[PDB]
UniProtKB/Swiss-Prot annotation:
Protein's gene: CA2
Organism the protein comes from: Homo sapiens (Human)
Site residues (Fine-tunes the proton-transfer properties of H-64), renumbered to this chain: 5, 60, 65
Pfam families reported in the protein's UniProt record: Carb_anhydrase
Record protein name field: Carbonic anhydrase 2
Effect listed in the UniProt record for changing residue 5 to F: Enhanced activity
Length: 258
């Protein structure tokens, strides 16, 4: 597959190789704040990252992933809409060419400059590859980024990007603390959806935080220096790696906050 975000292989084309692209639980979606209902059923959300062990950062030609050791229950997400325990496997971002676009989810049609996704798999399925085949297989924590003040906790990522400029490059990336990327409040919206890149599997419980984090213009300019291409190939800046909002269809978005 040769899917991307370019002029001729971008999201509007994905359905040809991945027909689930036009399915009933696709992501991202617009979050209409006036129609999302507070849900008293939601249990407290527990983001338990004290023991998180990062290993590596990789430019995969469509974003970069910070990868974690998920061989035991070290960094987990529980509670909220979730049943059981979800293990952190990687985080990545989606961002734009300019600050007025870049997020995948939108809030009353507002696009943010970027969106961070912390991806977790349901331990009841044993491994990630089994979990993505199940409707309750993954939990993705999405966090909006706006451009303002610098995020101290992001700077360790920013400073390694120069070393992974092109597709296929990786760098060691140990002792990174993902708690440094959280906003102050964990109020959220939740709905059932999908992976936002091919193969677009419909296996995700989305938990999208209402409070964005702030990053500096200098920080996001360094993201926009990455390349989609491999070493020595014609340079294509890694920008606008976001899928646009998809039809909500029958689904309800629930709010954790009154
Ligand atoms: Zn993502």
């Amino acid at each position: 597959h040769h899917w991307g975000y370019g002029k001729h292989n971008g999201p509007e084309h994905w359905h040809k190789d991945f027909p689930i692209a036009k399915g009933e639980r696709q992501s991202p979606v617009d979050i209409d704040t006036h129609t999302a209902k507070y849900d008293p059923s939601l249990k407290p959300l527990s983001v338990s990252y004290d023991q998180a062990t990062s290993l590596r950062i990789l430019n995969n030609g469509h974003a970069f992933n910070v990868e974690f050791d998920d061989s035991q229950d070290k960094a987990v997400l529980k509670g909220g809409p979730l049943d059981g325990t979800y293990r952190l496997i990687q985080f990545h971002f989606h961002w734009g060419s300019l600050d007025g676009q870049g997020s995948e989810h939108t809030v009353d049609k507002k696009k943010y400059a970027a969106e961070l996704h912390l991806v977790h798999w349901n331990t009841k399925y044993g491994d990630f590859g089994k979990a993505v085949q199940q409707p309750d297989g993954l939990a993705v924590l999405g966090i909006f980024l706006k451009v303002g003040s610098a995020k101290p906790g992001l700077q360790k990522v920013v400073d390694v990007l120069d070393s992974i400029k092109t597709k296929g490059k990786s760098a060691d990336f140990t002792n990174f603390d993902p708690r440094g990327l959280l906003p102050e409040s964990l109020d959220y919206w939740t709905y059932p959806g999908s992976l936002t890149t091919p193969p677009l599997l419909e296996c995700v419980t989305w938990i999208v935080l209402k409070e964005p984090i702030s990053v500096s213009s200098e920080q996001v300019l360094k993201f926009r220096k990455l390349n989609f291409n491999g070493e020595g190939e014609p340079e294509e800046l890694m920008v606008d790696n976001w899928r646009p909002a998809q039809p909500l269809k029958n689904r309800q978005i629930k709010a954790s906050f009154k």
